[PDB]
Amino acid sequence: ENVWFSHPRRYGKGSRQCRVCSSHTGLIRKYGLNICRQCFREKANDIGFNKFR
């Protein structure tokens, strides 16, 4: 009942966030991950993205 309080959030950096830490920049969107580039390196091995070469 308070019309004034929102704006479009349907495209761009503010439309999405990291699902861990709510950051907007550095977000990895590949394979539907929605995890920033620093939380992904924390969580690479227990997602399955191990590193070989």
Partner: protein, 96 residues
Amino acid sequence: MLMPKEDRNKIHQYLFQEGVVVAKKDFNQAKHEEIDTKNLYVIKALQSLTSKGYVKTQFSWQYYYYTLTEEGVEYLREYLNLPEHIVPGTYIQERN
């Protein structure tokens, strides 16, 4: 501010009739899953109950898990005016 009585009860009944509530760290969501009230209301009724004991709060990847304590449920029996100590709410309820 004013969160009305029919919104606070339906938060409080569900925490008695489920025993845990999850919520999201995303305000202005305005309707909780499984409760007919705002996501602002369920966070701030259960941040309120956490301060007076009664609820243990965990955050864990943006989604606000709340677990009821033992001193919490005995508050919610004199609040919601249930029969005395018959219904436990609701961990050991149906299959035990």
